[PDB]
Amino acid sequence: NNMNVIIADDHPIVLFGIRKSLEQIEWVNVVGEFEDSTALINNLPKLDAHVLITDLSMPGDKYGDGITLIKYIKRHFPSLSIIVLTMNNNPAILSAVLDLDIEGIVLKQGAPTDLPKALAALQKGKKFTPESVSRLLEKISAGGYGDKRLSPKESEVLRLFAEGFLVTEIAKKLNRSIKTISSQKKSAMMKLGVENDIALLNYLSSV
Amino acid sequence: MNNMNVIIADDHPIVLFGIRKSLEQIEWVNVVGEFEDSTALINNLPKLDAHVLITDLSMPGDKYGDGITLIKYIKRHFPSLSIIVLTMNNNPAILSAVLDLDIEGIVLKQGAPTDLPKALAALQKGKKFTPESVSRLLEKISAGGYGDKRLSPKESEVLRLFAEGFLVTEIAKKLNRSIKTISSQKKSAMMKLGVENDIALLNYLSSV
Amino acid sequence: NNMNVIIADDHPIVLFGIRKSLEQIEWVNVVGEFEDSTALINNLPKLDAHVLITDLSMPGDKYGDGITLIKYIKRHFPSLSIIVLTMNNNPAILSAVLDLDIEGIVLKQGAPTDLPKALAALQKGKKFTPESVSRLLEKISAGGYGDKRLSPKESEVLRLFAEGFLVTEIAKKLNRSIKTISSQKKSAMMKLGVENDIALLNYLSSV
Amino acid sequence: NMNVIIADDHPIVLFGIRKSLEQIEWVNVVGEFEDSTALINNLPKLDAHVLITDLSMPGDKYGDGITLIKYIKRHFPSLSIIVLTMNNNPAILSAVLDLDIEGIVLKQGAPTDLPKALAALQKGKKFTPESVSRLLEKISAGGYGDKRLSPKESEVLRLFAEGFLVTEIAKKLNRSIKTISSQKKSAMMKLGVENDIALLNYLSSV
Amino acid sequence: NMNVIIADDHPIVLFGIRKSLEQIEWVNVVGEFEDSTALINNLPKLDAHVLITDLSMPGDKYGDGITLIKYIKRHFPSLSIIVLTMNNNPAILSAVLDLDIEGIVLKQGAPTDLPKALAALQKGKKFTPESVSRLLEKISAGGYGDKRLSPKESEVLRLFAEGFLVTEIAKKLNRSIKTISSQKKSAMMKLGVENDIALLNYLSSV
Amino acid sequence: NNMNVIIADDHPIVLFGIRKSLEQIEWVNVVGEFEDSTALINNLPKLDAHVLITDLSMPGDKYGDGITLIKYIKRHFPSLSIIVLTMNNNPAILSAVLDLDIEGIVLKQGAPTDLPKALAALQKGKKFTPESVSRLLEKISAGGYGDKRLSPKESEVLRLFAEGFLVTEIAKKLNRSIKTISSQKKSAMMKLGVENDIALLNYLSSV
């Protein structure tokens, strides 16, 4: 079946390569290309397509930036399928994009194979997740904070610290020394990526 | 001042004894129970002739929670009880979290000889007690709960766009500045927030 | 069938009155009597009772005051059926008590047969609402704020005022005089029981 | 330089805005509107992301006042908004600031406030003039007035909300019926409520 | 004058509605549409009070059915909506009424219903025809059907949702396994669920 | 690290088997054995226990039944780790018990191997889920409604039906024959376990 597609990307060289790779798929018909979000949004009403392939970092000063722009397109064009094509390999960005409930994400890194597969899955009404995305979602598998998971003893020490126990009181409670629990705490702070107690306690309110 | 019955709880037996002796020198305060652990405190609360509890944060007990969670538990299960938290913990985020429980007040132990009687007096006049020391520690997280040195408008915008999914290079193009300037404003922002990597920065920014 | 009943009232003559009144009903067995909520709550784990008859003004050092005590009993002893017997005839109080999902309210100003009817309805698995309680609920029939409902014109004036229009600007838009809109505004305020514009705006912010 | 759109339906006030912005070299007015429908319909094509707008603007289509501003915020989220208003009511000004916008400028306030607001916006900062802050002091006690409820007043209201009749509050707090009736009456005046149903609804929110 | 927009992709129905409204002197038809894209794209331009629209209108942009109606409500909040539909499923009609629109008119209901809907709108009131109310009585028992769950059926379902086996329920209630199984079957038939998993999911999300 | 344990079960073969299994572990002490929920709740405050091994369907009505009793125990003794033992092999019950956030579940077949593993997992800090539980959860692996997943075509049909398209109008929308769509709807209704359009729509509204 014939699928009408719109491309939105502000990197001319990437846009060029996407156009060329979609021209070799006979059932894909490109009906628009845009370099900023104002032109994209203002023209979506007049173009017959229900697939948008879009990046995250488009310029424009009306309809929001990045994830907020994708949310905006979703709410204002609810029948439009969205594939996000991005160079952002940060795990927390990718999972936040997947929380929006869109067709799929394609990393520009592994993209020669993935974009045609994403479009194939879309034609069959399925979502697509390439190996290169689920690989990066494993780096936030241990509680959303990293590859090195907190040990059971580290987690208890941070739990008591978040409950209002000072290090000496944590030492007194679990029978270990002050040296031991100081290092179990320091170890845990390094894994979470935090430099002081204020920032540690803030971080633990979230998760 | 009218006569006021009081219950005291602290896991340090020497401090518990000390608190009792200080309060026995005040003729309008009468201590009717002392506890070392939270299990015995909770199990005895139903029978004790008092509705004012002065309590620690670091009590042992394997049953009703510990620290802030234990205080929550006491509030829920004994909602007429007035609670003063008497603690050594000076960490601002712990203090504001205890104040969010909507209790009578916090007394820091270093000021207890004068502030603990003032807390009990404020309770009789139906007002909360927050000593100057506690107010000043709360000022060390006055900028968005993360520190005293606030993010500049330029730093906030860089972080905002980073949270939206802009890479540093794309923020530079967006804001029309160099990659060196954006990288510098980001590094400064991360230091003020006290975060060391991007995963930590983005999890932190999911709160705001 | 027989029914075990606990009574709680902090007025000694009323507590005696209730016990004695129920003494006439052969199938009612009074298994406990309380003057304060602390003794009541401390004995509920031990007593086998289907029903608690209680007022709202009991003194108590521990388990809450009034409605909060009723919530407490409903939460911590979830099989206990509750009849609230109260002198409080304020419609918002009675409404808030009925929202807790109890057997029913009986007024101390009620009919001689109201409390016996409530107990009888409970045996049949049904809630009881006395006629006197229904008439009091009619006093807040119009949106919870009173008996006299806001007119369409009054509501439009308050809407525009809540959205930030001055009375002079409401006159211009609605094509009416300042006197007419002032009068409709003054009328709306009297129906809501509100004395100044700050109170009016805070009231409209909630509902 | 900064392009700007202006929306106000009082030509006298619109001249004062256009006059004071003519004095500022780095501001360009690229759009002027008198109703909200024309404003909203043209925002997609206007070469500006800064709007100076009236609160009480005519317009059948997209809402009125605070609701209109929320509508603009939602449909154009990158737009910075400065609200120009004749309304001096503290609760209204408070509710406009809760929208999270660049700021409010009063028409009655000083003539340099709008230049300052635009200058603040250049630096990424909100602007709140002294005239707005002065008016907000009128609701500094819990958003209901200038005079705070005393501890005794608050306890009386708390017990009333729990279902204690005035007679039972008196027995509970060991005081006369006229004392707590007086404290209740005083509390109701500070909140601005005339009867018990209004009082009890007010206490459910806060 | 009440300006009206009409939207239906069945031409027989679309021209029919035009004729129906031309008989009423104070109604002005300002637009006619066969799809939701053209409808939504022109709503900003057209000055209209009311929209008469069906539920199954084509369009690949702004949503389908109920979602299209919600979309129109959010983005054009002054537009009164009358839904004209051939769908007479009570759960659909109930869900459409929950949107807070002017009304529903069934296409197989009487030919005076649409004029009566427009007349009611002009007086500031909602219109619900008797044919719609009759269909709503088919889900009167808790939104699930005509026949309400008995007290005993509800007791059995309650224990089953708590994790009790039928044999355990029988023991607890001093009844036979067959009696409990029969009360369960009967309850499942009233609810319209065919297996235990569907029953539990149905009971948990309610 | 001596671990004090309470057992709550009214089935004698199961109670005996649990105690016998725990007798073999040197660091385990049984400090309570209860055959009804009221005795259990009344004695929880005065026993020094970290772990509760409890039955899902114990007698006693005072504090709730089943899943509701477990939530009640959780809220009133939040530091108490809970292992639920169950004769109920219904997948939807098991997932609802797991949603309570507890140490784990053991089926009735797991008198020997499952409890020592669960208790070892608990001492180390981790949850435990036996193979026998996982195997039964596979029966609801598709969306919580079964093991036969709705196809994309089926899901698109149901989505349009929930939005208020008649079957005739779904055929026009999707450009398929009415016969194909009726067939797709029927098969989708079978997978969900619903018998009429009202149940289907309520199912699609809620979950």
Coordinates of N, CA and C in Angstrom, one line a residue, chain E residues 9-10 54-60 63-67 85-92 95 138-139 142-145 155 158-165 168 171-172 188-202 205-206, chain F residues 10-11 55-61 64-69 86-93 139-140 143-146 156 159-166 169 172-173 190-203 205-207:
Chain E
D9 N -20.7 13.0 5.8 CA -20.2 12.5 4.5 C -21.3 11.7 3.7
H10 N -22.5 11.5 4.3 CA -23.6 10.9 3.5 C -24.4 12.0 2.8
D54 N -21.9 14.3 12.3 CA -22.0 12.9 12.6 C -20.7 12.4 13.2
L55 N -20.7 11.1 13.6 CA -19.6 10.5 14.3 C -18.6 9.8 13.4
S56 N -19.0 9.3 12.2 CA -18.2 8.5 11.4 C -17.5 9.3 10.2
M57 N -17.3 10.6 10.4 CA -16.8 11.4 9.3 C -15.4 11.1 8.9
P58 N -15.1 10.9 7.6 CA -13.7 10.7 7.2 C -12.8 11.8 7.5
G59 N -11.5 11.6 7.5 CA -10.4 12.5 7.8 C -9.3 11.8 8.5
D60 N -8.1 12.1 8.1 CA -6.9 11.4 8.6 C -5.9 12.2 9.4
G63 N -8.6 13.2 14.3 CA -9.2 12.2 15.2 C -10.5 11.6 14.6
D64 N -10.9 10.5 15.2 CA -12.1 9.8 14.7 C -13.2 9.8 15.8
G65 N -14.4 10.1 15.4 CA -15.6 9.9 16.2 C -15.6 10.8 17.5
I66 N -15.8 10.2 18.6 CA -15.7 10.8 20.0 C -14.4 11.7 20.1
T67 N -13.3 11.2 19.7 CA -12.0 11.9 19.7 C -12.1 13.2 18.9
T85 N -26.3 11.1 14.7 CA -25.7 9.8 14.5 C -26.8 8.7 14.3
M86 N -26.4 7.7 13.5 CA -27.2 6.5 13.3 C -26.8 5.4 14.4
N87 N -25.8 5.7 15.2 CA -25.4 4.7 16.2 C -26.4 4.9 17.4
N88 N -26.9 3.7 17.8 CA -27.9 3.7 19.0 C -27.4 2.7 20.0
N89 N -26.1 2.4 20.1 CA -25.6 1.7 21.2 C -25.6 2.6 22.5
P90 N -26.2 2.1 23.6 CA -26.4 3.0 24.8 C -25.1 3.5 25.4
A91 N -24.1 2.6 25.4 CA -22.8 3.0 25.9 C -22.1 4.1 25.1
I92 N -22.3 4.1 23.8 CA -21.8 5.1 22.9 C -22.5 6.4 23.1
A95 N -21.4 7.9 26.5 CA -20.1 8.5 26.4 C -20.1 9.8 25.6
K138 N -31.5 0.9 28.9 CA -30.9 -0.4 28.7 C -29.5 -0.7 29.4
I139 N -28.9 0.4 29.9 CA -27.7 0.3 30.8 C -28.0 1.0 32.1
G142 N -26.1 0.1 36.7 CA -24.7 0.3 36.9 C -23.9 0.5 35.6
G143 N -24.5 0.8 34.5 CA -23.8 0.9 33.2 C -23.5 -0.4 32.5
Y144 N -23.9 -1.5 33.1 CA -23.5 -2.8 32.5 C -24.7 -3.6 31.8
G145 N -25.9 -3.2 32.0 CA -27.0 -3.9 31.4 C -28.4 -3.5 32.0
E155 N -22.1 -10.3 46.8 CA -21.3 -10.9 47.8 C -20.3 -12.0 47.3
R158 N -17.6 -10.2 45.2 CA -16.7 -9.6 46.1 C -15.6 -10.5 46.6
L159 N -16.1 -11.7 47.2 CA -15.1 -12.7 47.7 C -14.2 -13.3 46.6
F160 N -14.8 -13.5 45.4 CA -14.0 -14.0 44.3 C -12.9 -13.0 43.8
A161 N -13.2 -11.7 43.8 CA -12.2 -10.7 43.5 C -11.1 -10.6 44.7
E162 N -11.5 -10.9 45.9 CA -10.6 -10.9 47.0 C -9.6 -12.1 46.9
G163 N -9.9 -13.1 46.1 CA -9.0 -14.2 45.9 C -9.5 -15.6 46.4
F164 N -10.8 -15.6 46.9 CA -11.4 -16.8 47.3 C -11.8 -17.8 46.2
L165 N -11.5 -19.0 46.3 CA -12.1 -20.1 45.4 C -13.5 -20.3 45.7
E168 N -14.2 -22.4 48.6 CA -13.9 -21.6 49.8 C -15.1 -20.6 50.1
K171 N -18.0 -22.6 51.6 CA -17.7 -22.9 53.0 C -18.0 -21.7 53.9
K172 N -17.6 -20.5 53.5 CA -17.7 -19.3 54.2 C -19.2 -18.9 54.4
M188 N -22.0 -13.3 35.9 CA -21.2 -13.2 34.7 C -22.1 -12.9 33.5
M189 N -23.3 -13.6 33.4 CA -24.2 -13.4 32.3 C -24.8 -12.0 32.3
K190 N -25.1 -11.4 33.5 CA -25.6 -10.0 33.6 C -24.5 -9.0 33.2
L191 N -23.2 -9.4 33.5 CA -22.1 -8.5 33.2 C -21.6 -8.6 31.8
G192 N -21.8 -9.8 31.2 CA -21.4 -10.1 29.8 C -20.0 -10.5 29.6
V193 N -19.5 -11.3 30.6 CA -18.1 -11.8 30.6 C -18.2 -13.3 30.6
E194 N -17.2 -13.9 29.9 CA -17.2 -15.3 29.5 C -16.3 -16.2 30.3
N195 N -15.3 -15.6 30.9 CA -14.3 -16.4 31.7 C -13.9 -15.6 33.0
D196 N -13.2 -16.3 33.9 CA -12.8 -15.7 35.2 C -11.8 -14.6 35.1
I197 N -10.9 -14.6 34.1 CA -9.9 -13.6 33.9 C -10.7 -12.3 33.5
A198 N -11.6 -12.4 32.6 CA -12.4 -11.2 32.2 C -13.3 -10.7 33.3
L199 N -13.8 -11.6 34.1 CA -14.6 -11.1 35.3 C -13.8 -10.3 36.2
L200 N -12.6 -10.8 36.6 CA -11.7 -10.1 37.5 C -11.2 -8.8 37.0
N201 N -10.8 -8.7 35.8 CA -10.3 -7.5 35.1 C -11.5 -6.5 35.1
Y202 N -12.7 -6.9 34.8 CA -13.9 -6.1 34.8 C -14.2 -5.6 36.2
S205 N -11.2 -2.9 37.6 CA -11.3 -1.6 37.0 C -12.7 -1.0 37.0
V206 N -13.3 -0.8 38.2 CA -14.6 -0.3 38.4 C -14.9 0.1 39.9
Chain F
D10 N -4.8 -21.9 57.8 CA -5.8 -22.8 58.4 C -5.9 -24.2 57.7
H11 N -5.0 -24.5 56.8 CA -4.9 -25.8 56.2 C -3.8 -26.6 56.9
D55 N -1.7 -17.0 54.4 CA -2.6 -17.6 53.5 C -3.5 -16.5 52.9
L56 N -3.9 -16.7 51.6 CA -4.8 -15.6 51.0 C -6.2 -15.6 51.6
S57 N -6.8 -16.8 51.8 CA -8.2 -16.9 52.2 C -8.5 -17.5 53.6
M58 N -7.7 -16.9 54.6 CA -8.0 -17.3 56.0 C -9.4 -16.8 56.5
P59 N -10.0 -17.5 57.5 CA -11.2 -17.0 58.1 C -10.9 -15.8 59.0
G60 N -11.9 -15.2 59.5 CA -11.9 -13.9 60.3 C -12.4 -12.8 59.4
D61 N -13.4 -12.1 59.8 CA -14.0 -11.0 59.0 C -13.6 -9.6 59.5
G64 N -11.0 -7.6 57.3 CA -11.1 -7.8 55.8 C -10.8 -9.3 55.5
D65 N -10.9 -9.5 54.2 CA -10.8 -10.9 53.6 C -9.8 -10.8 52.4
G66 N -9.0 -11.8 52.2 CA -8.2 -11.9 51.0 C -7.2 -10.8 50.8
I67 N -7.1 -10.4 49.5 CA -6.3 -9.3 49.1 C -6.5 -8.0 50.0
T68 N -7.7 -7.7 50.3 CA -8.0 -6.6 51.2 C -7.4 -6.7 52.6
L69 N -7.3 -7.9 53.2 CA -6.6 -8.1 54.4 C -5.1 -7.9 54.3
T86 N -0.8 -19.5 48.5 CA -2.1 -19.6 47.9 C -2.4 -20.9 47.2
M87 N -3.6 -21.4 47.4 CA -4.2 -22.5 46.7 C -4.8 -22.0 45.3
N88 N -5.0 -20.6 45.2 CA -5.6 -20.0 44.0 C -4.6 -19.9 42.9
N89 N -4.8 -20.7 41.8 CA -3.9 -20.6 40.6 C -4.3 -19.7 39.5
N90 N -5.4 -18.9 39.8 CA -5.9 -18.0 38.8 C -4.9 -16.9 38.5
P91 N -4.4 -16.8 37.3 CA -3.4 -15.7 36.9 C -3.7 -14.3 37.3
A92 N -4.9 -13.9 37.2 CA -5.4 -12.5 37.5 C -5.3 -12.2 39.0
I93 N -5.6 -13.3 39.8 CA -5.4 -13.1 41.3 C -3.9 -13.0 41.6
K139 N -0.1 -17.2 31.1 CA -1.5 -17.3 30.7 C -2.2 -15.9 30.5
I140 N -1.7 -14.9 31.1 CA -2.2 -13.5 30.9 C -1.1 -12.6 30.3
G143 N -1.5 -8.4 27.5 CA -2.3 -7.3 28.1 C -3.0 -7.5 29.4
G144 N -2.8 -8.6 30.0 CA -3.5 -9.0 31.2 C -4.9 -9.7 30.9
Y145 N -5.2 -9.9 29.7 CA -6.5 -10.5 29.3 C -6.5 -11.9 28.8
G146 N -5.3 -12.4 28.5 CA -5.1 -13.8 28.0 C -3.7 -14.0 27.4
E156 N -7.3 -2.1 15.9 CA -7.8 -0.9 15.1 C -9.3 -0.9 15.0
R159 N -10.7 0.0 18.5 CA -10.5 1.4 18.7 C -11.6 2.3 18.0
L160 N -11.9 2.0 16.8 CA -12.9 2.7 16.0 C -14.3 2.4 16.6
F161 N -14.6 1.2 17.1 CA -15.8 0.9 17.8 C -16.0 1.7 19.0
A162 N -15.0 1.8 19.8 CA -15.0 2.6 21.1 C -15.2 4.1 20.8
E163 N -14.7 4.6 19.7 CA -14.9 6.0 19.2 C -16.3 6.2 18.6
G164 N -17.1 5.2 18.4 CA -18.5 5.3 18.0 C -18.8 5.0 16.6
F165 N -17.9 4.3 15.9 CA -18.1 3.9 14.5 C -18.9 2.6 14.6
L166 N -20.0 2.5 13.9 CA -20.7 1.3 13.7 C -19.8 0.3 12.8
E169 N -19.6 1.5 9.3 CA -18.7 2.7 9.2 C -17.2 2.3 9.4
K172 N -16.1 1.2 5.9 CA -15.8 2.3 5.0 C -14.5 3.0 5.4
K173 N -14.2 3.2 6.7 CA -13.0 3.8 7.2 C -11.8 2.9 6.7
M190 N -13.7 -12.6 21.5 CA -13.3 -13.9 22.1 C -12.1 -13.9 22.9
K191 N -11.0 -13.2 22.3 CA -9.8 -13.1 23.1 C -9.9 -12.3 24.4
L192 N -10.7 -11.3 24.4 CA -11.0 -10.5 25.6 C -11.9 -11.2 26.6
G193 N -12.8 -12.1 26.1 CA -13.7 -12.8 27.0 C -15.0 -12.0 27.3
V194 N -15.5 -11.3 26.3 CA -16.7 -10.5 26.4 C -17.7 -11.0 25.4
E195 N -19.0 -10.9 25.8 CA -20.1 -11.5 25.0 C -21.0 -10.5 24.3
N196 N -21.0 -9.3 24.6 CA -21.8 -8.3 24.0 C -21.1 -6.9 23.9
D197 N -21.7 -6.0 23.0 CA -21.0 -4.8 22.7 C -20.9 -3.8 23.9
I198 N -21.9 -3.9 24.9 CA -21.8 -3.1 26.1 C -20.7 -3.5 27.0
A199 N -20.5 -4.8 27.2 CA -19.3 -5.3 28.0 C -18.0 -5.0 27.3
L200 N -18.0 -5.1 26.0 CA -16.8 -4.7 25.2 C -16.4 -3.3 25.4
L201 N -17.4 -2.4 25.3 CA -17.2 -0.9 25.4 C -16.7 -0.5 26.9
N202 N -17.4 -1.1 27.9 CA -17.0 -0.9 29.3 C -15.6 -1.4 29.5
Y203 N -15.3 -2.6 29.0 CA -13.9 -3.2 29.1 C -12.9 -2.2 28.4
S205 N -13.3 1.0 27.8 CA -13.3 2.3 28.6 C -12.4 2.3 29.8
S206 N -12.6 1.2 30.7 CA -11.9 1.1 31.9 C -10.4 0.8 31.8
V207 N -10.1 -0.5 31.3 CA -8.7 -1.0 31.3 C -7.9 -0.3 30.2

